[PDB]
Design a binder for these strands. Structure first.
Ligand SMILES: Cc1cn([C@H]2CC[C@@H](COP(=O)(O)OP(=O)(O)OP(=O)(O)O)O2)c(=O)[nH]c1=O
Ligand SMILES: [Mg+2]
Lengths: 1006, 218, 426, 57, 69, 65, 57
DNA sequence: CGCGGGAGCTATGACCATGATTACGAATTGC
DNA sequence: GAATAAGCAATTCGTAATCATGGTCATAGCTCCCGCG
C-alpha cells in the first residue's frame, strides 16, 4: 500500500499520539496514527533497575558512551576520555518519566520515532496493511512502525492540495481593529486534489447599497445568502460578513496539505477567527484524523529568545494550533528567516522576487508597452513575471516609478504588458511588483463599487502572490529537503533554528556510529579567535583579481582534523614557555603526526601562553560524519543547481545549497555555542585555528607567485602546515597553459577562506583560464585530503573600502569577455539595510562618477576631491532646500527585538512608544521602517546631539506633515563620511566636514 | 481615588492614583472591546472588572499573576473565594501552609497581604470557559501588567502554557517567576518552591520580604 | 525558575551577595555566574554582576576613636589587633587580603584547620587573620550568634596560633586612658607586635577598634632584612637612634616609598614602632622604588609576595625542606623515601614539576612566569640542557633578574624533580 | 666676586633645603605639599627673572 | 632628628628658610639689575652656568612633590 | 605741574622701590657674610656716612612744621 | 668690586632725589609730608640696620 | 618709632564648560 | 495543565564615560598704604 509522507504531526492532550498525513498514488489521503512515546536511553544496569518496568524496550546494541568534557591538562598525563561501552536500551514511555542518569536526552521524541523505526520523514513507503488497523474513514493506526515502514519505495508525485489566501480589512484609522472594523475582501486560491486552481474573491456586501449590490450582480458577480449557496467557481462573490467568515471557516476547516498566507497568522487568520467569534460566535474547529479530539484556531505566539548578550526575546513567529495535519504556512516568517531585505512586507518581497528586465515595444503618451522574454532577461524570469502578471495590477518600472497595468497578454515564453507609464528614454527597464500608487484608507472613505472591484483585484493578487512566492522560493521542495535531511516533520522543518535541525541526522549518526555523548562538568565559555581577515593592500584595483574560495572551509577543517567533542584526546595548556617546550617535545614523541593532529591555538585564559588540542584521526568523529552528511546534501543540490535551466529552479537550488552551507557552518557554530549539546570549545577553536592556517597557507603560496615559460612557481613551499605528508612540496608545478604566459600573482585581500589573487593581466578570458589552471593546480598539488578551493569569479574594478567592504564587477567562471559583468556589492552602503535609499543612490552615482574621472586620468586628485565635494555640497543643499526626494528615499530599517543590555534602550523605547500610540504593533523580529524626522522650522544643525530622539517609525500610512521634515543632517553626515572615506585627501575633507557638519570625520586606516 | 466615565459596561471605573498614567489608554481599548465583551455572560459581573484598579501600587512589590478569573463565581479579586471551593486558591493555601506551618485556616486571600497585588492577566472570561476573553483583554492586559511591573519588584505567574509569552507581552524587564498553575497535573505545584523564591528574590532586590501568613483567614 | 534546586541556588546567590566585600575572586566569579543564571532565568534581578569589588570589612568595624573615652558597663572581650596583613577567610574558603582581593597561598595544615573551623559553624561570616613573620594568627572571629572566644578555643584545639583572649568585667564608667591601654597590652603578654586593641560586647555587634598612638616622624638610617624562614626575609627599617620600625610587607615598603635618609610616617606605641599604611608622595614609580630597595639591600634578594627571598646554591636540602621530609643526599634514596611516604607521594602526583621546582626555591608565581615566558629552552629528555633569554625588558625588574641569576640552580632542582617524577610513576 | 660667593652660598643653602625636601616629601600632606609647591613656583619666578637679567642685560 | 613628630613646625621652618632663600635670590637679582643699569661691563657665562645648575636643582626638588594621583 | 599729586605719587612709588633695594642690599650683605669670605667695608662705611649725612639734612629740610 | 660702583650709582640717585626735593619742596602739604617723613624714618631704620651689619664685623 | 587694620595685586589650586578621545553597545554583514 | 538557542571579524553610527584644554572663581601669599599710640 504505497504512500508518500506529506506531514507528521502530534496530538496534544488526552493520549499522546503521533499522526502522519500521507497520500497514495490515486490521490486519496491516508492518515496513520502512532502511539507517541517519550524516548529515553539508559545503560544495561539502569534498564534493569527502573523501579516500574518500561512500557516498551528495544535493544540498542553495545553502544559507547563518551564523556565530552573539555578539561585542560598542563602536562601530557592526559587521562583517557571516559568511554563506557555498554549494551543500551530504548525506553518507550507513554508519559514523561524522570530517569536518573538517562542519556541522549537532548534529542526529541519525534526524531527518536523516526530513526529507531527507520522512517524517513520525506519518504515513500509501502505500508503493511496487517500492521495497520482502521480507526475511521481515511485514518489508520500503526502499533509497529519498524515492520510497517520497512519497504522504502522510490519517490512518486502526489496531487498536493493548497489554500493560498489573503484578506483585506476596512480601516478608517491607521490599522484595522477587529472589534470596530469589518472585513472588506477575502481572496482564496483553492487548489484542490484534482489540480484545479480556483481564484475567487469574497466581497462584503454590507459595505455596498442595494442598488450598488444589484449593479455588482449585473456586472457578473454572484450573490449568495448562506454557506450552501456558495459557488467556488465564481471568481467574484458578494455576501455578508457572516457568510464570508463562514466560508473562511469552511475553507480553513478543510484538511488541506498547505494553507499558505503572507503575515496571515499574525493578521489574516487571526482576524478571521476574531471576527468570526465576534459576529456569530463560531470557531474554526480543527479535527484530529481519528476525530478523538478537536481544537479551535488560536494563533499561539511563539517567541525566539536570542542566544547572545542578555539572551533577550529576539524574534516572534505566529503559528496555528491545528491537529488536522494541514501545514498552515506563514510566508512572512519564512522569508524573514531566509531572505535579507529592507522590508518584509509583501510589496518589498514581490519587489525583490518578481523583478524582470523588459524592453519597450510601443511608446505612447501615457501607455508604454513592455515585453519580456528569454532574450531580455534570464530564462524563466519572464515566465514567472507573466505568471505573477496573470493576477497583477501594478508593475513598478525601474525602482521609483509605479505603473498600473492596462492590458496584459500572457505569451508562450514570457509576458507583454501595457502600463500607465510616462515617456522614458531608455529601451530596456527593470520591471517588478513593488509598491502601489494607492492610499488605502482614503479610498476606503469614498468606498464605492469600482473601489470594491479594484480591491478585489488587489486582494486576489495578494492571495495568488502567496502562491507565486510559494513556487518562487520552492517551499515544497525546501520542505521535502528539510524533512529528508534534518529528520523533522514537514510542519517542523522551518520553525526551528540550527540546533533542532542538527539533532535529527546527529541522532542518525549516533545510532549508526554507536556513540553517546554525555557531560559531567559544566561547560565553560571563553572568547576564541575566528577567521583571518586580511587588510586590503590598496583601495582601488584597475587590475584583475582572481577569487579562490575553499569549498566549505570550516566543515572540511572539521572533517580533516577530526574535530569533534569526542575525538578530542586532550587540551594541553602551558602558563610558561618551559612546560610549553616540554609539552611540545612530548607532543611530537607521544602523539604521531598522521594519527593525531596537534592544533596550536591562542589561549583560552590570559595566564596560559599556549593551548594545543589533540584530535584522534583514527575513528571518524561525530562532527566530521555529520559534516560529511551535510556536504553530501549540499553537493547534491549544487549538482541540481548546475543542472537547472530556468531561473526559478536555479534560485531554489541555490537557496537550498546555501541552506545546507549554513547548516554545515552551524555544525561548527554549535561547537562554539556554550548552550549546545555539541559544545566543544577546543574543537571550534581548533576549527578556526586550522582554518586560519589554511588561509595563511593559501595566501603564502599565492602572494609572490609567478607563472613564467608555462611553469608556475609558488613563493613558499607546498608544505602541509600541520605535519609531514607523502605528497610533493615542490612549488615548481607543471601547468597546461601556453608557454608565452608570463604573469605574476599577489594576494591583495583575504576574507576568511576567500583569497583575492591580483593577476597583472587585465584580460577577462586570460584571467579566467589562468585562474582555472590555478584552481586545478592548487587542488591537485597545494591542497590535501578534503580541502578543495573553487575559483568563484574574476572581480574587475575592485573598489575595496575596507575589510569585508568592496565593490566590483564580477566575471564568473562560466562567463567570458562577452558576458555581462555582475555588480557585486559586499557589505557596502548598497547592501546595508540601515542605509537609506538616498544614500545608496547617491553613493552609486558618485562611485560611477569617481570611476569615470579616475579612468580619465588627465587631472589631479586634489581637484578630484574639490570637484566631487563641490558637487556633493550642491546636491545636498539642493536636497535640503527643494526636498523633492520623498520619504521613501530616506527610510532606514532595523529589526525589533528585546535583546538589549539596557532596559532603557532608545530603539526599544521607540518601538514601545509606537506600539502604544498606534494600532500597528511591531512584533519581535519584525523589520520596521524608521526615519529621522524633525520639525521643519529647525535650521541646519552643526553641533548634533540626541540623534536617536529624532527617529520616527514610518509605516505605509505615514505622511510627512507640513510642520514635519526629514532630518537630512544625519543622512548627509553618513553619506559625506562614506564619500570622504572614498575620496582620501584628509585635510580638505576635515575642512569641508567642519564647515558643513562641525565635526571631525572618521577616516578608515588600512 | 480618581474615577473616569466610560460609554458602557460598568459605566464608571474607580482607580487608585498610581494607576493614572495607563487610564486613558485603558478607556481607549475598553470602549472598543467592551461592547463585544458584554454579550457573553462573563464569569465575574462587569462591575467587579476593575476592583483591583482601586488598589495602590507603591506598597505592592509582588505581583501574583493568574491568566484569568475562575470560569465560575468570579468575585472580581484574583485568587479570592469566600466559599473556598476553588482548587487554585486551595493549593495556593496548601503551599503557604506547607511553608509557614499555619494549617488551621478557614481560607486564604492574596489581596489582604501587604506588598502582594493579586492579578488576573485577562480581567474576565466567559462563564465556564478559560481564556475565552483573551481576545478582548490582550491590549488591556499588556498595558495594565506593564504598569504593574513598572512598580512591583517581583512578578509571579501561575502557568507555564499561559505565561510562556510573558517576556514578550511585557517589554520592561522585571523579576518574572513563571510558576506552575495549581491545577496543573503531576502535582507540580506541590513540588515547586516558588513562594520562598519570591522572598529570596525580594531580599536580592533589598526589598521587604512578603509575610505569607497575612493572607490566611481564620 | 521554580524548583527546589533553583531556590537553593538563589539562597547561595543571596548569601554571596551579603558577603561581596568578604569573598575571594573565585566566589566573586561564582556570584557572577549566579547573577547570570538569575538574569537568564528570572529576567531582571536586583543584583548585578560585579567587576571590581573593594575588599573592606569596615561595615562590621566601627570608626577608630583615637582618643580616651568612657567605657560603658558590661561584658568585654578585648582582642589584640596585630601589625601584619589583615586576611579574612570567607565561605569561599580561600584567604582574602583587605584592599586587594587576591587569594594568597598558605600552608595546607592551616587551610585544613580553617576548613574544620568553618565546618564547625556556618554562622561565622569570616575569620580575621594576621600575616606577620609568616605565621598565621587569628585576629578575630566574627559570627552572628556565637562569642569569638569559643572559636578561639575551638581553633586552639586544631593548632592555629591563637592570641591571649581576655574577658574583663566592667561595672562602672571607667575612663580608657593610655595607661590602662598599656596595662591591657601587657596583660595580653605577647611578643607579637600589636597596633591596637578591639573589644566586643557580650550581646551587641559592631566591634570598635581603639588605638592610642602618636603620629611620629623619625629619620631613617637603613633598611635591614631579618630571616623569618628557610628563604624568606621580613622587611625592617631602622632609625639613626637604633629604634626598629616594623614593616608589614614588602608592599608596605613600596607603598610607603621608603628609602634611606628620609623621614617616614611611623605610629609610635608603648613598645613597638609601627609604620603607617600610607601612599608615598615622592612620585617615584613602583619599579624604580623596587630597584632602589634591592640596590640598597642587595641583588641576591627578590620580592616574593610579602617578603624578600634569598638566592644561592640550591640542591637537595631545600627540596627536602619543601617536601618536609628527611634529608637525602642522592636521587635514589630520595625516591625510595618518597615511596615510603604515601602522602608526599600523592602530593608529588597532584603537583607538577614546574610548580614543585618553583615552590622549592621560593620563587613567586607571576614574576617567574613572566621571566620564563621571555627566554628560550633547548630541552633534551624533559631536562633543561641549555637556556637563552630573548627579551631583556623583563631583566629591568630586579626580582626577575635575581631569579634569572639563580636560574642555573633552578635548572638543577628542576632536573632533580624531573628524575624523581620519572622514576616514581614511569 | 661677592656676587659669585653669594650665589655659591645660595646654591649650598638651597641644596641643604632640597635635601630636607627629599627627606620629608615622601610623607607630606596635600596642603603643605601645595604650599611648598607654591614656594617652588616663586623660586622658578625668581630664577627666570635672574635669567632675564643675565640674558637681556 | 631625634624622635620628631607632627611635621607642620618642620614644614613652617622649611617654608621660612625657603622664604629667606627667595629674598636672597631676589636681592641678588635686583642688585644685579642695579649694577647692570650702572653701566659696568660684566661677563656672566659662569653666572649663567650657575643659574642653569640652580634651575636643575630646583626642578629636581620640584618633581617629587607637586603631582597628586 | 598742577596740584602736586603726580609728584607725590611718583615719590611714593620710587621710595618703596628704594626701601626694597636697601633691604636687598642688606640681605645680600648678610648672604656674603654668612658665606664665610673675609671682606672689608671701609669704603662703604664712608659711603653710608655721607649718604646718611645728606639724607639727614634732607629730613631736616622736608618737615612740614 | 661691583658693590662699590653700585653704591656710587645709589649715591648719584639720592643726589638727584635730594636736588629735586630742594627744587620742589617750597610747598609739600601736610599729609604727604607726614607720609614721606615716616618713609624717611623707616629708611633711617633700614640704614641703621645696614650700619649694624657693616660694623658687626 | 613701631605694629595693627585694610586694600589692591598676583598667582594658584580647584571647579566647571566645551570639545575631542575612547569604550561600548547595536545593527549589519561577511564570512 | 505542560510540553530552544550556530561561531567570530569587522565596520559604522550613536550614546555615554573620560580626559585635554581653556575660562573662571575662591583663596593664600604678599606687599604696600595708612594710621594711632
Ligand atoms: C557563510 C558562513 C560562513 N561561516 C564560516 C564557515 C567557513 C568560513 C568561510 O565560509 P564562506 O562562506 O566564505 O565559504 P564556504 O562556506 O566555506 O565555502 P562554500 O561556499 O561552501 O563552497 O566562514 C560561518 O561560520 N557561518 C556562516 O554563515
Ligand atoms: Mg568557502
Amino acid at each position: 500500500m504505497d504512500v508518500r509522507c506529506i506531514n507528521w504531526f502530534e496530538s496534544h492532550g488526552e493520549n499522546r499520539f503521533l499522526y502522519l498525513k500521507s497520500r497514495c498514488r490515486n490521490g486519496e489521503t491516508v492518515f496513520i496514527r502512532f502511539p507517541h512515546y517519550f524516548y529515553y536511553v539508559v545503560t544495561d544496569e539502569i534498564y534493569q533497575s527502573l523501579s516500574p518496568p518500561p512500557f516498551n524496550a528495544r535493544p540498542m546494541g553495545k553502544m559507547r558512551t563518551i564523556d565530552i568534557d573539555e578539561t585542560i591538562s598542563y602536562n601530557l598525563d592526559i587521562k583517557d576520555r571516559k568511554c563506557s561501552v555498554a549494551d543500551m536500551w530504548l525506553i518507550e514511555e507513554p508519559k514523561k518519566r524522570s530517569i536518573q542518569n538517562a542519556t541522549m536526552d537532548e534529542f526529541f521524541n519525534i526524531s527518536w520515532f523516526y530513526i529507531s523505526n527507520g522512517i524517513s520523514p520525506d519518504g515513500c513507503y509501502s505500508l503493511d496493511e496487517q500492521y495497520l488497523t482502521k480507526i475511521n474513514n481515511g485514518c489508520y493506526h500503526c502499533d509497529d512502525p519498524r515492520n510497517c515502514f520497512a519497504k522504502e519505495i522510490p519517490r512518486f508525485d502526489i496531487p498536493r492540495s493548497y489554500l493560498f489566501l489573503d484578506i483585506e480589512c476596512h480601516f478608517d484609522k491607521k490599522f484595522p481593529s477587529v472589534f470596530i472594523n469589518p472585513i472588506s475582501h477575502t481572496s482564496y486560491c483553492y487548489i484542490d486534489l484534482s489540480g484545479k486552481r480556483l481564484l475567487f474573491t469574497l466581497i462584503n456586501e454590507e459595505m455596498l447599497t442595494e442598488q450598488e449590490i444589484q449593479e455588482a450582480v449585473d456586472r457578473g458577480c454572484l450573490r449568495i445568502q448562506s454557506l450552501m449557496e456558495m459557488d467556488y467557481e465564481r471568481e467574484l462573490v458578494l455576501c455578508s460578513e457572516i457568510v464570508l467568515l463562514r466560508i473562511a471557516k469552511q475553507l480553513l476547516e478543510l484538511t488541506f496539505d498547505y494553507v499558505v498566507t503572507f503575515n496571515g497568522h499574525n493578521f489574516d487568520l487571526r482576524y478571521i477567527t476574531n471576527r468570526l467569534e465576534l459576529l456569530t460566535g463560531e470557531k474554526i474547529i480543527f479535527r484530529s484524523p481519528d476525530k478523538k479530539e478537536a481544537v479551535h484556531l488560536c494563533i499561539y505566539e511563539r517567541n525566539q529568545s536570542s542566544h547572545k548578550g542578555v539572551c533577550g526575546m529576539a524574534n516572534t513567529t505566529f503559528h496555528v494550533n491545528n491537529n488536522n495535519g494541514t501545514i498552515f504556512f506563514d510566508l512572512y516568517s519564512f522569508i524573514q528567516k531566509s531572505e535579507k531585505l529592507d522590508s518584509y512586507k509583501l510589496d518589498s518581497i514581490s519587489k525583490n522576487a518578481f523583478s524582470c528586465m523588459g524592453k519597450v515595444l510601443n511608446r505612447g503618451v501615457r501607455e508604454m508597452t513592455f515585453i519580456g522574454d528569454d532574450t531580455t532577461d534570464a530564462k524563466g524570469k519572464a515566465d514567472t513575471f507573466a505568471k505573477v502578471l496573470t493576477t497583477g495590477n501594478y508593475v513598478t518600472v525601474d525602482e521609483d516609478i509605479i505603473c498600473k497595468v492596462i492590458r496584459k497578454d500572457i505569451l508562450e515564453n514570457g509576458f507583454k504588458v501595457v502600463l500607465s507609464c510616462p515617456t522614458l528614454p531608455n529601451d530596456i527597464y527593470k520591471l517588478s511588483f513593488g509598491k502601489d500608487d494607492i492610499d488605502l484608507a482614503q479610498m476606503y472613505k469614498d468606498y464605492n463599487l469600482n473601489i470594491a472591484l479594484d480591491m478585489a483585484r488587489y486582494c486576489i493578487h495578494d492571495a495568488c502572490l502567496c502562491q507565486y512566492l510559494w513556487e518562487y522560493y520552492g517551499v515544497e521542495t525546501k520542505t521535502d529537503a528539510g524533512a529528508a535531511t534534518y529528520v523533522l516533520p514537514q510542519s517542523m522543518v522551518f520553525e526551528y533554528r540550527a540546533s533542532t535541525i542538527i539533532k535529527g541526522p546527529l541522532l542518525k549518526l549516533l545510532l549508526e556510529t554507536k556513540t553517546i555523548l554525555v557531560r559531567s562538568e559544566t561547560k565553560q565559555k571563553f572568547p576564541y579567535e575566528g577567521g583571518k581577515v586580511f587588510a586590503p593592500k590598496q583601495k582601488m584595483f584597475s587590475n584583475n583579481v582572481l577569487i579562490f574560495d575553499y569549498n566549505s572551509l570550516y566543515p572540511n577543517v572539521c572533517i580533516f582534523g577530526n574535530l569533534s567533542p569526542e575525538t578530542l584526546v586532550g587540551v594541553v595548556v602551558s602558563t610558561n614557555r618551559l612546560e610549553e617546550e616540554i609539552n611540545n617535545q612530548l607532543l611530537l614523541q607521544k602523539y604521531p603526526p598522521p594519527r593525531y593532529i596537534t592544533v596550536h591555538c591562542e589561549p583560552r585564559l590570559p595566564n596560559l601562553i599556549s593551548e594545543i588540542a589533540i584530535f584522534d584521526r583514527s575513528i571518524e568523529g561525530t562532527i566530521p560524519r555529520l559534516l560529511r552528511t551535510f556536504l553530501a546534501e549540499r553537493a547534491r543540490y549544487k549538482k541540481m543547481l548546475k543542472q537547472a535551466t530556468s531561473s526559478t529552479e536555479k534560485a531554489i537550488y541555490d537557496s537550498m545549497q546555501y541552506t545546507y552551507k549554513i547548516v554545515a557552518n552551524s555544525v561548527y557554530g554549535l561547537m562554539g555555542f556554550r548552550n549546545s549539546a555539541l559544545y566543544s570549545y577546543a574543537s571550534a577553536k581548533s576549527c578556526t585555528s586550522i582554518g586560519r592556517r589554511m588561509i595563511l597557507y593559501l595566501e603564502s603560496v599565492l602572494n609572490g607567485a609567478e607563472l613564467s615559460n608555462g611553469m608556475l612557481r609558488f613563493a613558499n613551499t607546498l608544505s602541509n602546515p600541520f605535519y609531514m605528508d607523502d605528497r610533493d612540496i615542490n612549488p615548481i608545478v607543471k601547468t597546461s597553459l601556453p608557454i608565452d604566459y608570463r604573469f605574476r600573482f599577489r594576494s591583495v585581500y583575504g576574507d576568511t577562506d576567500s583569497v583575492f589573487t591580483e593577476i597583472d593581466s587585465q584580460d577577462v578570458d586570460k584571467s579566467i583560464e589562468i585562474a582555472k589552471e590555478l584552481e586545478r593546480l592548487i587542488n591537485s598539488r597545494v591542497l590535501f585530503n578534503n580541502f578543495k578551493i573553487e575559483f568563484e569569479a574574476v572581480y574587475k574594478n575592485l573598489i575595496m573600502q575596507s575589510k569585508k567592504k568592496y565593490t566590483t564587477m564580477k566575471y564568473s567562471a562560466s562567463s567570458n569577455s562577452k558576458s555581462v559583468p555582475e555588480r557585486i556589492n559586499k557589505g557596502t552602503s548598497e547592501t546595508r539595510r540601515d542605509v537609506s535609499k538616498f544614500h545608496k543612490n547617491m553613493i552609486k552615482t558618485y562611485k560611477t562618477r569617481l570611476s569615470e574621472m579616475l579612468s580619465e586620468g588627465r587631472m589631479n586628485s586634489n581637484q578630484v576631491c574639490i570637484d566631487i565635494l563641490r558637487s556633493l555640497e550642491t546636491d545636498l543643499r539642493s536636497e535640503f532646500d527643494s526636498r523633492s526626494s520623498p520619504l521613501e528615499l530616506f527610510m532606514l530599517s532595523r529589526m525589533h527585538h528585546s535583546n538589549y543590555k539596557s532596559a532603557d534602550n532608545p530603539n526599544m523605547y521607540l518601538v514601545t512608544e509606537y506600539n502604544k500610540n498606534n494600532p500597528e504593533t511591531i512584533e519581535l523580529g519584525e523589520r520596521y521602517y524608521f526615519a529621522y524626522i524633525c520639525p521643519a522650522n529647525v535650521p541646519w544643525t552643526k553641533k548634533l546631539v540626541n540623534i536617536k530622539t529624532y527617529e520616527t517609525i514610518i509605516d505605509r500610512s505615514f505622511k510627512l506633515g507640513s510642520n514635519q521634515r526629514i532630518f537630512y543632517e544625519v543622512y548627509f553626515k553618513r553619506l559625506t563620511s562614506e564619500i570622504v572615506n572614498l575620496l582620501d585627501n584628509k585635510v580638505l575633507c576635515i575642512s569641508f566636514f567642519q564647515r558643513m557638519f562641525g565635526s571631525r570625520p572618521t577616516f578608515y586606516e588600512a | 481615588m480618581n474615577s473616569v466615565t466610560i460609554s458602557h459596561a460598568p459605566y464608571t471605573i474607580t482607580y487608585h492614583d498610581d494607576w493614572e498614567p495607563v487610564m486613558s489608554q485603558l478607556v481607549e481599548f475598553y470602549n472598543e472591546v467592551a461592547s463585544w465583551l458584554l454579550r457573553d455572560e462573563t464569569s465575574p459581573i462587569p462591575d467587579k472588572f476593575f476592583i483591583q484598579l482601586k488598589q495602590p501600587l507603591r506598597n505592592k512589590r509582588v505581583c501574583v499573576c493568574g491568566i484569568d478569573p475562575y470560569p465560575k463565581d468570579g468575585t472580581g479579586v484574583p485568587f479570592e473565594s469566600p466559599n473556598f471551593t476553588k482548587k487554585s486558591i486551595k493549593e495556593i493555601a496548601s503551599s503557604i501552609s506547607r511553608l509557614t506551618g499555619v494549617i488551621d485556616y478557614k481560607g486564604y486571600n492574596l489581596n489582604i497581604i501587604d506588598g502582594v497585588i493579586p492579578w488576573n492577566y485577562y480581567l474576565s472570561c466567559k462563564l465556564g470557559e478559560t481564556k475565552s476573553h483573551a481576545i478582548y483583554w490582550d491590549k488591556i492586559s499588556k498595558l495594565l501588567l506593564q504598569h504593574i511591573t513598572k512598580h512591583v519588584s517581583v512578578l509571579y505567574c501561575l502557568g507555564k502554557t499561559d505565561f510562556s509569552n510573558i517576556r514578550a507581552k511585557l517589554e520592561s524587564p522585571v523579576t518574572t517567576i513563571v510558576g506552575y498553575h495549581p491545577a496543573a497535573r503531576d502535582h507540580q505545584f506541590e513540588k515547586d518552591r516558588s513562594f520562598e523564591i519570591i522572598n529570596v528574590l525580594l531580599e536580592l532586590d533589598n526589598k521587604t520580604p512578603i509575610n505569607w501568613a497575612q493572607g490566611f483567614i481564620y | 525558575m521554580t524548583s527546589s534546586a533553583d531556590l537553593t541556588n538563589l539562597k547561595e546567590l543571596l548569601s554571596l551577595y551579603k558577603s561581596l566585600r568578604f569573598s575571594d575572586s573565585v566566589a566573586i566569579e561564582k556570584y557572577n555566574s549566579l547573577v547570570e543564571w538569575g538574569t537568564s532565568t528570572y529576567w531582571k534581578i536586583g543584583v548585578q554582576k560585579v567587576t571590581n569589588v573593594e575588599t573592606s570589612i569596615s561595615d562590621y568595624y566601627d570608626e577608630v576613636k583615637n582618643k580616651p573615652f568612657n567605657i560603658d558597663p558590661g561584658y568585654y572581650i578585648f582582642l589584640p589587633v596585630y601589625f601584619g596583613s589583615v586576611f579574612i577567610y570567607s565561605k569561599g574558603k580561600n584567604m582574602v587580603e583587605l584592599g586587594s582581593g587576591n587569594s594568597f597561598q598558605i600552608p595546607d595544615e592551616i587551610r585544613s584547620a580553617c576548613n574544620k573551623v568553618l565546618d564547625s559553624d556556618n554562622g561565622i561570616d569570616f575569620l580575621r587573620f594576621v600575616l606577620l613573620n609568616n605565621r598565621w594568627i587569628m585576629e578575630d572571629a566574627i559570627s552572628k550568634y556565637q562569642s569569638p572566644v569559643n572559636i578561639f578555643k575551638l581553633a586552639s584545639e586544631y593548632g592555629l596560633n591563637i592570641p591571649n583572649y581576655l574577658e574583663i568585667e566592667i561595672e562602672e564608667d571607667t575612663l580608657f586612658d593610655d595607661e590602662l591601654y598599656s596595662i591591657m597590652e601587657r596583660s595580653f603578654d605577647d611578643t607579637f607586635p600589636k597596633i591596637s586593641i578591639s573589644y566586643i560586647k557580650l550581646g551587641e555587634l559592631k566591634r570598635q577598634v581603639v588605638d592610642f598612638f602618636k603620629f611620629s616622624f623619625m629619620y631613617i638610617e637603613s633598611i635591614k632584612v631579618d630571616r623569618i624562614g628557610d628563604n624568606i626575609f621580613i622587611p625592617s627599617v631602622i632609625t639613626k637612634s637604633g629604634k626598629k620600625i616594623l614593616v608589614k610587607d614588602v608592599d608596605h615598603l613600596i607603598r610607603s616609598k621608603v628609602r634611606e635618609h628620609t623621614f617616614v610616617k611611623v605610629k609610635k606605641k608603648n613598645t613597638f614602632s609601627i609604620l603607617y599604611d600610607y601612599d608615598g608622595n615622592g612620585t617615584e614609580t613602583r619599579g624604580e622604588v623596587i630597584k632602589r630597595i634591592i640596590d640598597t639591600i642587595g641583588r641576591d634578594y627578590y620580592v616574593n609576595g610579602k617578603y624578600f627571598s634569598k638566592v644561592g646554591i640550591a640542591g637537595l636540602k631545600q627540596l627536602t625542606n619543601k617536601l618536609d621530609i628527611n634529608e637525602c643526599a642522592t636521587v635514589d634514596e630520595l625516591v625510595d623515601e618518597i615511596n615510603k611516604s604515601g602522602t608526599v607521594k600523592r602530593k608529588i602526583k597532584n603537583q607538577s614539576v614546574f610548580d614543585l621546582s618553583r615552590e622549592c626555591l621560593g620563587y613567586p608565581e607571576a614574576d617567574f612566569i613572566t621571566l620564563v615566558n621571555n627566554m628560550r629552552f633547548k630541552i633534551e629528555n624533559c631536562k633543561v640542557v641549555n637556556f637563552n633569554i630573548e627579551n631583556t625588558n623583563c631583566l629591568n625588574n630586579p626580582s626577575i633578574e635575581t631569579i634569572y641569576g639563580n636560574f642555573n640552580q633552578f635548572v638543577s632542582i628542576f632536573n632533580t624533580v624531573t628524575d624523581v617524577k620519572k622514576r616514581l610513576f614511569e | 666676586s661677592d656676587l659669585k660667593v653669594a650665589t655659591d652660598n645660595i646654591v649650598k643653602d638651597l641644596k641643604k633645603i632640597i635635601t630636607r625636601i627629599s627627606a620629608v616629601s615622601t610623607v607630606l600632606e596635600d596642603v603643605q605639599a601645595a604650599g611648598i609647591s607654591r614656594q617652588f613656583t616663586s623660586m622658578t619666578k625668581a630664577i627666570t627673572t635672574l635669567s632675564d637679567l643675565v640674558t637681556e642685560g
